[PDB]
Amino acid sequence: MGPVWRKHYITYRINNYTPDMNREDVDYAIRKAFQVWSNVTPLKFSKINTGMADILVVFARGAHGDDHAFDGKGGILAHAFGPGSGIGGDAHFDEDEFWTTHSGGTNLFLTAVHEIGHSLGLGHSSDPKAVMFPTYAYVDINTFRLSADDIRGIQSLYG
Ligand SMILES: NC(=O)[C@H](CCC(=O)O)NC(=O)[C@H](CCC(=O)O)NC(=O)[C@H](Cc1cc(-c2ccc(-c3cccc(Cl)c3)cc2)no1)CP(=O)(O)c1ccc(Br)cc1
Ligand SMILES: [Ca+2]
Ligand SMILES: [Ca+2]
Ligand SMILES: [Ca+2]
Ligand SMILES: [Zn+2]
Ligand SMILES: [Zn+2]
Numbered sequence: 001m002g003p004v005w006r007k008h009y010i011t012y013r014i015n016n017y018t019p020d021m022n023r024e025d026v027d028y029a030i031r032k033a034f035q036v037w038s039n040v041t042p043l044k045f046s047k048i049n050t051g052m053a054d055i056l057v058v059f060a061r062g063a064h065g066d067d068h069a070f071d072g073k074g075g076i077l078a079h080a081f082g083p084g085s086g087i088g089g090d091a092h093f094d095e096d097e098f099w100t101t102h103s104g105g106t107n108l109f110l111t112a113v114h115e116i117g118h119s120l121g122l123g124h125s126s127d128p129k130a131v132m133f134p135t136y137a138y139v140d141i142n143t144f145r146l147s148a149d150d151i152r153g154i155q156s157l158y159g
Pocket of ligand 6: 114118124132133134
């Protein structure tokens with residue numbers, strides 16, 4: 001019942017890069033996170049560098065220009081706007097976290113999967129093994145899979 005994109009081609013742009021990781025690793029984590037959702041829907045995601053993307057990926061700190069101020073290290077890791085124009089769809093990551101490609105700090109890929117879920121219109125799950133469960137958990141990235149509840153949720157919105 002969340003808001004949905006009324007198109008199946010969706011662009012994203014990485015507005016800026018956390019210094020916690022190198023650029024290529026941020027690109028990879030984000031690309032893989034989009035792929036998780038495209039794998040089970042008719043949605044396709046293209047990265048653009050120049051132009052007007054639907055989903056802007058932003059790393060920012062504290063009060064950063066919207067109604068969802070961050071809180072420094074810990075607590076809220078990120079937040080994202082549901083489908084819509086402008087700031088709609090955009091996914092913001094708290095730079096006061098330490099973003100990583102691994103089990104240390106906060107795993108960017110896993111957080112991005114959750115965030116992109118919100119960017120596509122998903123709410124939270126009650127399944128503790130669903131990526132849309134409200135609180136972060138690290139799971140081995142190689143064996144990561146959407147739960148049946150996540151797939152149900154996203155397939156109910158698209159396709
Ligand atoms: N509490 C925690 O474990 C970590 C912090 C750990 C730390 O100290 O670094 N924080 C969190 O988990 C916090 C809790 C927020 C709260 O206080 O309610 N959640 C958040 O930060 C939400 C953002 C968020 C959640 C996740 C996540 C969730 C589940 C899993 C997962 C779980 C099980 C299996 C698998 Cl495979 C994956 C992985 C990542 N990744 O990012 C914030 P949001 O939901 O986008 C949101 C909602 C409303 C507003 Br307004 C703004 C943003
Ligand atoms: Ca925080
Ligand atoms: Ca947008
Ligand atoms: Ca950081
Ligand atoms: Zn924000
Ligand atoms: Zn959430």
